[PDB]
């Protein structure tokens, strides 16, 4: 079965592939060979009106209050908690990945410091401590995100 920890381990590859494919699409618009890599890619491509709205919110707040390498954990905890205060669905889980991507990107591009390894640990620790990983585990794991 999908354990809570198996979801946590799989989250590293899912988030890495998600960040890779989101950055690639963002660079093409500017001008996998793994099961978790396919999940990451399928979640990176989805462009409904809620995720596009989520991204607009993530960008605006980051442009207003630029995150630093020293506040990023508290910055992450606030928005990630805000995303699962009403409940837990796949749309909010994807927005979590989306915010993790915009957070790592802003610290890299504005703070001149690579932070993907730290934001990845932020996402994994948050999903572990705030029941998001077990919510995914009950649905058979990250593989359930493939066929929405």
């Amino acid at each position, epitope marked *: 079965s999908m354990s809570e920890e198996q979801v946590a381990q799989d989250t590293e590859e899912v988030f890495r592939s998600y960040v890779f494919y989101r*950055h690639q699409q963002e*660079q093409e618009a*500017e001008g996998p060979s793994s099961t978790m890599g396919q999940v990451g890619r399928q979640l990176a491509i989805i462009g409904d009106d809620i995720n596009r709205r989520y991204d607009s919110e993530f960008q605006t707040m980051l442009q207003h209050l630029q995150p630093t390498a020293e506040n990023a954990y508290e910055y992450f905890t606030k928005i990630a908690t805000s995303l699962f205060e009403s409940g837990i669905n796949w749309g909010r889980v994807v927005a979590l990945l989306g915010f993790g991507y915009r957070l790592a990107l802003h610290v*890299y591009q*504005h703070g001149l410091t*690579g932070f*993907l*390894g730290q934001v990845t640990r932020f996402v994994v620790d948050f999903m572990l401590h705030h029941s998001i990983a077990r919510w995914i585990a009950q649905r058979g794991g990250w593989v359930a995100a493939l066929n929405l």
Partner: antibody
Amino acid sequence: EVKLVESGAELVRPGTSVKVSCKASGYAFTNYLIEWVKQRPGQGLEWIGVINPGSGGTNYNEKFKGKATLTADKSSSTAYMQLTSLTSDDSAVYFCASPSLYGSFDYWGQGTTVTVSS
Amino acid sequence: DIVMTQSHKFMSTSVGDRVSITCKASQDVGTAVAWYQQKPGQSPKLLIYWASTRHTGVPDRFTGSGSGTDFTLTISNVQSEDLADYFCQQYSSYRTFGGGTKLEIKR
């Protein structure tokens, strides 16, 4: 593929300034950082600073603030490092690098030798 | 400044043995540590990033471990192409490199 090609060797007299170039190809120059590293003969590695070519934002090793000036030309996809008031302590090999989103220096240039002598 | 200390500048190994290069940081750097190989005349090459993640094209015999302050680069089944310089690095906002460890053959 991803390539970083630096300028040719520099041989100059003390008190002069040199500007090393770092040409990028095979990726989006404006979307990745450019790191600069100094390696003295027989010695180890020393970080100088980083620049974001898209924004022109710079951070420096505090030792090199006022000594090294990092710039970038988006048109040419070339980063530049200007060293002023050259002394014997500046004689070294200078590498440019581009890090991944993690921060590790994935791609390195070949290296530019700067020799300061009278 | 964060100081990456490679306590041994020279390490003696043998072909087919395993050797570990230690690197202690002066602060907690989490897992934001990288390992680089350098051979004479050549630019450094990334081997391990994220303390333990092998970079693309790097042989399986290179492994990294550690978190916080102590980090170790372990080379299993040492080959002759592995005799080189090995630098640890923390890539926080102000990046610093370790002093390096030169690998030699025991005799």
